[model samples]
Target: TATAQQLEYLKNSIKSIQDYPKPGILFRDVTSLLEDPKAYALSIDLLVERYKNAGITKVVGTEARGFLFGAPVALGLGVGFVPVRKPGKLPRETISETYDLEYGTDQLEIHVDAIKPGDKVLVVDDLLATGGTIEATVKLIRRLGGEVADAAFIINLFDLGGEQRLEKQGITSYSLVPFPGH
Candidate 1:
């Protein structure tokens, strides 16, 4: 566990950008945190410690951003890193899940063999914007007979209720930093 001071430092490292990729959207950028050695190390250490005893067999990260932290945490925990990617990105025979996006629908894929029955999984992502992605990931894991130990994220958009949605589905949610709204 990180002390309050350490956690604050890590939170401070995040940069906020207004109207990024669109209007009325505030994007929380963690690249600054990644650039700061202490903040970066502390972030990973805290997450690793949280799951060190959770019987996790694999860490699954959602495409792109999730890969950044998920891979390192998987290494620290001595488990394998599994990527949940967009359609057509993975080469192996994959189990896919189509989730509702703000507009239409999007799908995520995981290798069929990525998780075996009864395997414990930890789903990771950079941020929890809407419950869609994480919810979809959990459904995929369950479909493959894997147990979802928890879902972890670097940031949580509190107003979105993504964590709440996961909790409603019986999944524990963990976030390093939380912001009130988008």
Candidate 2:
């Protein structure tokens, strides 16, 4: 997991939203960048180009934001798209996995057969924070018999050790924009 793609305009455009989703948790998101067509266009193009030749059979995404990037990338690569959603979201024979948060625990659900054996899966998300969310996503993929091909993100919180955590799981991660511990 390394900082491979760097764009000053994309970096400068990301301003952290303070105290969102609760107090003391500052977040840098891609909503503004997504609002810009060029950046949004380039974002998918960049990710697709990076993995176009990696033999990705499926693109697995989690919840809302991941779907945004994952769907287009899946289409671009001419592969299948699977969404690993939260509880009660996917109406099917779904399986769920839980992960602990700062104090409480959260769960994710996916269709029982969403991933097939021997599928090379690419996990996608909007951000990486401690990697708790996507880690659970990876677990869900594994339980369904899919191999984690790699991970992709729009923005990464490098200071939080999320990348290192994913690397320990034997997953390689690539992010378009990386924020240093500033």
Candidate 3:
């Protein structure tokens, strides 16, 4: 397990951008932390430690940012890494779920055969912003008939009300760092 000191360093190293990709949005920039070897390793270690006993058979990371931390965490945990991507990215038969993006609605797809029935899955992402994407991913996992062991992220945008949104759907998630707002 990563020590408290390591968690503090990770939380301090994370950067934030204001109005990125649009106004009224604060993007959690983690490139600085990812670039640092110690920070990166701790990032993966923290996740592996948290979900190590969750019966996780597979680690599913959302497209784009989720890969930053998800890949190494999967490697550390010795689980297969599955990419939940936008539509048409996967060549095989896939299950699709549409989500409300910051600006508009969009869909994410996962290969149908990627997850075997009864497989325990863990969904990983960088941040939980309003729970739209994560919600869609959970739905996708259900469509594949895989049980979601848990959902994890590097940070949780608490002020955005993601926790409430997810809890309302009976979905629980974890975060290495908690953000009170933004």
For candidate 1, lDDT tens digit of each residue in 90-123? 9989998999987899999999899889799998
Q: What C-alpha lDDT do the candidate models reach, one value each?
A: 0.89, 0.86, 0.83
Least accurate stretch of 10 residues (summed lDDT) in model 2?
Answer: 1-10
Top candidate on TM-score is 1
Checking candidate 3 for backbone clashes, the offending pairs are none
lDDT score, candidate 2: 0.86
Clash pairs for candidate 1: none
Q: What is the per-residue lDDT of model 2 for residues 20-136, given as tens digits with 9 covering 90 to 100?
A: 767877778688888888778778888999998898999998889989999989999999999988899888898888987999999999897879899999998888878998889
Residues 74-122, model 3: lDDT tens digits: 8888989999998888899988888887679999999988888878988
The TM-score obtained by model 3 is: 0.91
- TM-score of each predicted structure versus truth: 0.95, 0.90, 0.91
Clashes in predicted model 2 = 0
